[PDB]
Symmetry: D2
Subunit: 275 residues, 4 copies
Amino acid sequence: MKLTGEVALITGGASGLGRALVDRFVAEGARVAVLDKSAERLRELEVAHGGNAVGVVGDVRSLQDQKRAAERCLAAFGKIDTLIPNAGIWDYSTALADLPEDKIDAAFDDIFHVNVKGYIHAVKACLPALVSSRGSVVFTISNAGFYPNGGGPLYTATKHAVVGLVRQMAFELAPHVRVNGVAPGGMNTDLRGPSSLGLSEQSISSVPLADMLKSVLPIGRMPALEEYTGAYVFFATRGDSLPATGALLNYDGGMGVRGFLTAAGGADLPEKLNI
Amino acid sequence: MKLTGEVALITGGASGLGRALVDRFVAEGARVAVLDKSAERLRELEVAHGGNAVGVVGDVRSLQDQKRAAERCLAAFGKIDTLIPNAGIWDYSTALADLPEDKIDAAFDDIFHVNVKGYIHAVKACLPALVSSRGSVVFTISNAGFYPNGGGPLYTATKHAVVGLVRQMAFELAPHVRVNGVAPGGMNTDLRGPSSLGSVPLADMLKSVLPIGRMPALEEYTGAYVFFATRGDSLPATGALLNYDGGMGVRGFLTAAGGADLPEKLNI
Amino acid sequence: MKLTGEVALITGGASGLGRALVDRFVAEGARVAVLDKSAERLRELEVAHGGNAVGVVGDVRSLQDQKRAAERCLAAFGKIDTLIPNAGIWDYSTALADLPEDKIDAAFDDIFHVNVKGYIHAVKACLPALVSSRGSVVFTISNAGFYPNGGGPLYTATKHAVVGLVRQMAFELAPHVRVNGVAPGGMNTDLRGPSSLGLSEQSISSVPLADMLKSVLPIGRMPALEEYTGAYVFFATRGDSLPATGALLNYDGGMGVRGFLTAAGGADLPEKLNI
Amino acid sequence: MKLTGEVALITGGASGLGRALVDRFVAEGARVAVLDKSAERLRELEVAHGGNAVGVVGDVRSLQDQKRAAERCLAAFGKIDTLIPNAGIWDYSTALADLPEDKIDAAFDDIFHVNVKGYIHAVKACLPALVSSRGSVVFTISNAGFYPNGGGPLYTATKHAVVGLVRQMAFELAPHVRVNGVAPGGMNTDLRGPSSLGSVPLADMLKSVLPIGRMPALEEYTGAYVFFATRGDSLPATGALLNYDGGMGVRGFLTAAGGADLPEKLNI
Ligand SMILES: NC(=O)c1ccc[n+]([C@@H]2O[C@H](COP(=O)([O-])OP(=O)(O)OC[C@H]3O[C@@H](n4cnc5c(N)ncnc54)[C@H](O)[C@@H]3O)[C@@H](O)[C@H]2O)c1
Ligand SMILES: NC(=O)c1ccc[n+]([C@@H]2O[C@H](COP(=O)([O-])OP(=O)(O)OC[C@H]3O[C@@H](n4cnc5c(N)ncnc54)[C@H](O)[C@@H]3O)[C@@H](O)[C@H]2O)c1
Ligand SMILES: NC(=O)c1ccc[n+]([C@@H]2O[C@H](COP(=O)([O-])OP(=O)(O)OC[C@H]3O[C@@H](n4cnc5c(N)ncnc54)[C@H](O)[C@@H]3O)[C@@H](O)[C@H]2O)c1
Ligand SMILES: NC(=O)c1ccc[n+]([C@@H]2O[C@H](COP(=O)([O-])OP(=O)(O)OC[C@H]3O[C@@H](n4cnc5c(N)ncnc54)[C@H](O)[C@@H]3O)[C@@H](O)[C@H]2O)c1
Ligand SMILES: Oc1cccc(-c2ccccc2)c1O
Ligand SMILES: Oc1cccc(-c2ccccc2)c1O
């Protein structure tokens, strides 16, 4: 186990990547606290992992719930080694032109409150525990944090913003707490949009992501959620990622190195070297 | 005069970088519309520039006030060629540890509303006019949009966030409207912060910070904007990011600059 | 004139972008020295510009010729305000698999000698004059200096390398000489490949660049060479670019902000806002 | 043991970062082939690791020596899963002003030949085996591949150049072979330079330089490579760049780190 005796706090861990993360982290010897708004799914993750997992119902936008999550984690486990702010909301790539005027201000607050403020409240709440442990923060970014076309202006703005927290928090929490970001590509999760845009109940699993991403990713397929948890274990392992603070790992099937006419340069290499 | 017949709309153009831009765009033969919250400072630029300026007293956070900036720019001048969303707010470099739990929620909103939403509203408000003139957007960023230590978590994330609007608005507004970002640093503007809040001077730390070894006057930050607003010079450029901070990101570990003793070394 | 009384030295200025640059710079009040290997084209540029242009035959790979170019510039004009290293060679995007083993080492030296060493020798030679003038260096990069698919490993490596000289030379020549890079996209020039690859006599003007780039650039067309000179005037104007050292201006029709399924997001905006 | 059944080929794996990698990959259950110019140091790792290593004494600049590294890795172990081109040469941070006109031409070649061509030859030599195992390449970069002041013009351009091989080889070797770069800094390796040449210590400047506030042992730089060579953990990642330098690019203007007084501030 890369991670025996380590203690993680993960927000948005009752679905999608945050759940796979929880599963992975427990399989690696860690004990995990989850702050999520989803009551039933938090209990589902608790009964799956038998004491190695604590689940706290609450909102990432409330510092208080976040503080509660920290407190419960400390009460359940003794410490926090790794903070993984992760809970998130999409805009479904609604362009600026298509953001209705009566809806922009509300959509703005909703997406930024979860995506950016939710991250800031995770760090504020866990700060005393992370300095105590010399632990580390790993933020879930996205390809939308580096290149356009992965979300509308709201969402691309929020992910670019977390890159800004990666850097500012690596600076500010040094030398006691390390700060890094993982930037996953498309995932088959239960990612939702905001009420403003009537996307509360739209789920990204309902979008033909696997179909689309086959054409676009150099690596010629969308990874399974299992395969997006590895990078987080890396940053959560003391002995492996000690020299990394400030790090931005693009973890997206190579969206930033794709070609202009094809995603991949070497589909026919095996036969070009004729094996 | 590089911009004769061109019309700009500049938000936060009544003080600091924004005033220097008004003056410069007006001196280049451009006519300028200005949305600023400072009515008295809007007065002064209106007297300064005759009919070559119009101010609208509004808040960059209000989409409607933004609409009136645009519409009044259209009524005065007939078009908008270049939009410079520029209004912004700083956090005094307040470290997360030092943001009070009871202030953090409002202060997040105040800073992100002006700095980010404000930029979004300015574009949204100017979209039909820009697409019509096939114009250009130049957002003002900051060194804090790329490197730590130019603001706390709130400011830095706001300025990283606008790096994102550059790229996504470049993509989205193409092929009609070009979108770029200028990232100034090294200024000593009277950049203030929100009510929510009540950091050693740039002079005190310049040798560890600015390879250029000097503090440029505001007027020296105007040229990049003129360039990105000149269609005959900046046409290839959309999505671009111009670090304009005196070399902050190319500074040395022990000193900002490494060739202080060049003239004496090269016998100059 | 943005540039009255200014003095430029441009390498590779007898063809393609370097020529347009020369033309532009003279139209802007500047006097221009050109180091190029092309004898006849250097004389052609001299007779076009009547005293405002000096041309020196020589190779960018020889420090000596480069020194000669500096000397001639000083003799002709009195000073050097702006150094524009620019001469270059392409690999035509020959993939690693297609670089023959008997040819890699020679192709390596040729492309790196021109693309990177040629730049280093321009700066070494003009250094005394640029400190004297407090002038500035502007390197011609490329999109191949930022993203793949604009050249093979050799060429993408050389352009990434000049990004490295942008940064190291902005640092090292501060506070007396500013250092910046412009990174143009595809251009209809007379860009050649190396002898090793039998590309000496292949010209990029013979590649359907305009056709290809129509699909790929957000801006929906390849710019004319006239329209790639503006950025250089910006960096060559004292009063406009004084706070820029270290700067990297992507100047390529928006290759880094293109979409996954289309280059541009807003082909049908006029009708979306219905004008 | 994270890499049981996996085979790596590591160039410059007989000292510094490369030796730490050999040891670490061997301790993870991997079998390792090593191309290094240092025959005596190749001896020591051969005795250190029993049959779990093989060295070939060669030069990373020679395509043929590279071919024998690969082929001998195949004869010994049957496959290559992970190639770590890692051999490199520094310039002592020799400033351009200080590169002698008579040395500059050779020194350009020596440094670029090992550092860049060497990386190219290693991949080229290992291409049929990597594509066959659907493996991965991890080039060693450097802080000098991103920020100034970790080498003169020659070194820095060499390490920026490898950032380019990452992206172009990611593109070109896809979808079969993933290519990433690790960029270490903050080490105190015995990094030497070319004959052509005959810079204050990291200890002397650490507080302006490393937010982590400490000098990590070599062994602490191995984990990222293990990660990028573990197919079940690093599969999404191709073209990636992992800054692994203690936070050099996220350091402050006046001090590297900004929360030195956190424990006392948070009452820890
Ligand atoms: N899914 C993708 O394509 C993708 C790609 C890149 C990055 N990301 C990022 O991955 C992260 C995880 O999202 P996901 O993709 O697993 O979607 P998901 O909806 O399946 O998981 C996100 C979790 O966030 C929780 N959550 C949302 N708002 C909350 C709130 N206000 N308070 C408490 N909990 C809240 C939800 O209950 C859910 O369990 C987000 O940061 C997302 O932007 C997603
Ligand atoms: N200080 C630096 O070195 C530095 C560096 C990079 C970028 N900047 C940026 O430069 C841009 C211009 O600011 P400045 O530095 O010139 O500071 P400034 O305060 O002198 O100028 C800001 C202007 O914006 C106006 N403004 C502020 N909030 C507003 C609102 N809500 N609605 C309407 N108008 C509003 C102010 O009244 C003022 O006229 C900002 O985006 C700032 O973030 C400053
Ligand atoms: N053309 C493109 O698509 C493109 C795109 C981005 C960047 N660039 C860069 O633009 C620059 C200019 O090249 P171009 O596109 O105008 O091609 P070009 O061949 O038309 O111009 C380049 C000039 O370099 C000169 N030159 C080449 N080798 C030389 C040597 N060893 N010594 C002296 N002079 C030499 C040639 O004579 C020629 O006049 C290069 O740095 C190139 O990589 C080109
Ligand atoms: N010093 C730092 O902080 C730092 C930072 C980032 C990256 N690096 C890089 O780490 C990598 C490993 O180097 P190191 O720092 O461990 O230094 P090192 O000298 O201790 O290791 C280099 C190894 O490469 C071998 N080598 C050198 N030239 C060779 C050649 N031409 N052919 C074959 N083998 C050759 C040497 O014999 C030695 O075993 C290099 O790419 C170096 O550039 C060092
Ligand atoms: O972070 C993200 C979250 C959700 C979707 C995407 C996405 C990207 C490209 C195409 C379609 C969706 C994304 O990047
Ligand atoms: O710098 C460059 C020089 C020559 C060609 C390209 C290019 C890029 C994309 C597609 C085709 C050619 C390039 O980027």
